[PDB]
Amino acid sequence: IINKKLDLSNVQSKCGSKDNIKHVPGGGSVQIVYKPVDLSKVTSKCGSLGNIHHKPGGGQVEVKSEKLDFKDRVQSKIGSLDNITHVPGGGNKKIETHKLT
Amino acid sequence: IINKKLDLSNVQSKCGSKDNIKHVPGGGSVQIVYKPVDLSKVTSKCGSLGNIHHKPGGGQVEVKSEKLDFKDRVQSKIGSLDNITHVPGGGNKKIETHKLT
Amino acid sequence: IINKKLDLSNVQSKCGSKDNIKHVPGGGSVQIVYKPVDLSKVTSKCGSLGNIHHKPGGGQVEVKSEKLDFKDRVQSKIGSLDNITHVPGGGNKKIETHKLT
Secondary structure, three states, X not given: OEEEEXXXXXXXXXXXXXXXXXXXXXXXXXXXXXXXXXXXXXOOEEOOOOEEEXXXXXXXXXXXXXXXXXXXXXXXXXXXXXXXXXOOOOOOEEEEEXXXX | OEEEEEEOOEEEEOOOOOOEEEEOOOEEEEXXXXXXXXXXXXXXXXXXXXXXXXXXXXXXXXXXXXXXXXXXXXXXXEOOOOOXXXXXXXXXXXXXXXXEO | OEEEEEEOOEEEEOOOOOOEEEEOOOEEEEEEEXXXXXXXXXXXXXXXXXXXXXXXXXXXXXXXXXXXXXXXXXXXXXXXXXXXXXXXXXXXXXXXXXXXX
C-alpha cells in the first residue's frame, strides 16, 4: 500500500448551523442576527501595468424607524417558550418538561 | 494498491442549515436574519495594461417605517411556542412535553 | 505501508453553530448578534508596475430610531423561557423540568 495526497483544500463544515433564533417583543423592538457563511478563494495575478480591483459587496442591514408611538399599555405575558425533551437515553421513565397539574 | 490524490477543492457542507427562526411580536417589530451561504472562487489574471474590476453586489436589506402609531393596548399572551419531543432512545416510557391536566 | 501527505489546508469545523438567541423585551429594545463565519484564502501576486486593490466589503448593521414614545405602562411577565430536558442517560426515573402542581 502506498497512500499519497496533497491537501490544498478549503473547508467549512457544519458552520453557522442549528441556531435557534427567537424574537418575542411586546412592541417596538429590533432583532438582527447577521450570520453569513462565506468561503472565498481569490488568486489575483497582476503583471505589467495592469490593475485589479477586487471589491465584492458586503452585506448591509439597515433598520430605520422615523416615528413610533404607543399610546396605551404594551404588555407581554409568556408562560413558556420552546419546551424540548430530547431523551436519546436507553430506558428512562416518567420524563417531563413543563408539566402543569 | 496505490492511492494518489491532489485535493485542491473548496467545500461548504451542512452550512447555514436547520435554523429555527421565530418572530412573535405584539406589534411594531422587526426581525432580520441575514444568512447567505456563499462559496466564491475568483482567479483574475491581468497582464499588459488591462483592467479587471470585480465588484459583484452584496445583499442589501432595508426596512423603513416612516410613521407608526398604536392608539390602544398592544398585548401578547403566549402559553407556549414550539413544543418538541425527540426521543430517539431505546425503550423509554411516559415521556411528556407540555402536559396540562 | 507508506502513508505520505502534505496538509496545506484551511478548515473551519462546527464553528459558529448551535447558538440559542432569545430577545424578549417589553419594548423599545435592540438585540444585534453579529456572527459571520468567514474563511478567506487570498494569494495576490503583483509584478512590474501593477496594482492590486483587494477591498471586499464587510458586514454593516445599522439600527436607527429617530423618535420612539411609550405613553403608558410597558410590562413583561415571564413565567419561563426555554425549558429543556436532555436525559441521554441510561435508566433514570422521575426527571422533571418546570413542574407546577
